[PDB]
């Protein structure tokens, strides 16, 4: 019993944290096999950052401009690429530590843990959701970038996510570990917002489940209804829209519990009609949505 | 920016753990130099755990009695005791990973990570808080016993809790890493219950503190108040009573923010009286307890380990 948000242990992502420094910036790097994966504004100073030309930045470095600490030892870098917004620095040694890993692009709606990193060590682990804006709503302070995103199902470790930026609004963008950006934007200080973000509705009703599964059943309603009509509901609350492949994702926990998924829209629309009127669900007093289907069944 | 419940990293815990079998029973141990600590109902049977008599039960069975697995490498055990309500199995081999660790008994509002592990293996890692009432929300399954909890304080591993038992609630109940058990609970299938709950004052205003330093200030008032009227209001809504000690810890924050202590409780007795008015706070409808004053400061600030 009991229902958390749960990170996954992050000792096998510790085991690749290094400190990667070029010039003056220093911030945090991946260190997988002979290769240190990093942001590749690690190059930039703050006065490159507008409008980096990256191939002309990156073509004046030699290996010894990049400085790659792991622990209280430095790497030999012997080679570097570029790939998308990441740099991939050869060393000349291979992490010993390196676990089972992949590198996976995520969709909006997954959820990963963060091993928040400074100086190329790790200062805590959270759980985070991609959101459908293709931010992340972490917690990150200067330095942090390089810090990354995983998860660890069945002892291989999948990143998924590399630290790249904050936004104004406080909430974070990155890349995959390709390089490739989450959303639109863009490594560059030029004007960028976070577009209106909305409540992941498949996770809303995975966590509902979990509620279900836990012993609560107050949000539960006599009332079904179709797909179309909650999605005409749920659009009105900012709620992204459910399809038909999140109602298939959901037919486990349906046929767990006993609860259509049809019958569980019905609750949340009722929910989102009607507050909690002084309850909670799952020791929370807001609908939570940084819980997959997947995690649900994971930890219940 | 942001503000997320955030565990410790676990790695330096993930390996100590192991996994003990004792005939039908397999749970969670914690290999620390030479020794497993465990708890010490991987001896009862269910039958047993109705009244059980440790000594008599732990007196029939012999070292070879106790498997322990490390990973896919089996430990021999070659000695075992109990101290309290935690066994403790004597292994031939000291474990290489033992990080610089101390064993510390918490109070109630302090936080601490857990790492839940079945068979020996992590699974997830999450943030606890000791509450008033001496149980902790986790999140654990059948398996999840000996699962332990702990701080990093600079390179040393503070080991606070091992799980032991779930109560009716849904909440649960466990020990330090001598067996103490935190609460008025003990290692039998009796009835136990969960007593009423409080909230970790000190800490909901820690949690307005970084709130306020992530941008979060529409609570703030031109208010102030004594210690003893907050007191009066804290009775009142089941808060845990705010002490000097506590207002002296929150000094720093006070200072960042430029709030006084009794400024923000000011703010805290409002939101008391009158609730969020459709409002969150980190978003959050509820006040948050589980963030202690340092557990704060050390995100706001990026310490790492
Ligand atoms: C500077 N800084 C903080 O104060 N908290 C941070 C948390 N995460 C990230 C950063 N930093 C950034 O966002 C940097 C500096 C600003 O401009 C840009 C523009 C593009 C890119 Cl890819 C990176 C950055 C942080
Ligand atoms: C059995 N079990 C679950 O199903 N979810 C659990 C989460 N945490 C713990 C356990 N198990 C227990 O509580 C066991 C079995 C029941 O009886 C007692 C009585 C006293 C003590 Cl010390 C331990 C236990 C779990
Ligand atoms: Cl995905
Ligand atoms: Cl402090």
Redesign the pocket.
């Known amino acids: 019993s009991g229902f958390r948000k749960m990170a996954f242990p992050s000792g096998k992502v510790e085991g690749c944290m290094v400190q990667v420094t070029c010039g003056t910036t220093t911030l945090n790097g991946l260190w997988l096999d002979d290769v240190v994966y990093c942001?590749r504004?690690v190059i930039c100073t703050?006065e490159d950052?507008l409008n980096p030309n990256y191939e002309d930045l990156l073509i004046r470095k030699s290996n010894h401009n990049f400085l790659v600490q792991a622990g209280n030892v430095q790497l030999r870098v012997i080679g570097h690429s570029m790939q998308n917004?990441v740099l991939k620095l050869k060393v000349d040694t291979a992490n010993p530590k390196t676990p089972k890993y992949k590198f996976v692009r995520i969709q909006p709606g997954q959820t990963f843990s963060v091993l928040a990193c400074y100086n190329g060590s790790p200062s805590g682990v959270y759980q985070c959701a991609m959101r459908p804006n293709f931010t992340i709503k972490?917690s990150?302070?200067?330095?942090?970038?390089g810090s990354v995103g995983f998860n660890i199902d069945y002892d291989c470790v999948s990143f998924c996510y590399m630290?790249?930026?904050?936004?104004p609004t406080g909430v974070?963008?990155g890349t995959d570990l390709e390089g490739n950006f989450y959303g639109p934007?863009?490594?560059?200080?030029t004007a960028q917002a976070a577009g209106t973000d909305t409540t992941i509705t498949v996770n809303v009703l995975a966590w509902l489940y979990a509620a279900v599964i836990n012993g609560d059943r107050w949000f539960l309603n006599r009332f079904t209804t179709t797909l179309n009509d909650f999605n005409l509901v749920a659009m009105k609350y900012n709620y992204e829209p459910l399809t038909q492949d999140h109602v298939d994702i959901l037919g486990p926990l349906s046929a767990q519990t006993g609860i259509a998924v049809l019958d569980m829209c019905a609750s949340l629309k009722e929910l989102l009609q009607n507050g909690m009127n002084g309850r909670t669900i799952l020791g929370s007093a807001l609908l939570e949505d940084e819980f997959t289907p997947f995690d649900v069944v994971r930890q219940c």
């Open positions: 942001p504004h703050s950052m917004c972490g990150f302070l200067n330095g942090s970038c630290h790249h930026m904050e936004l974070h963008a934007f863009v490594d560059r200080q």
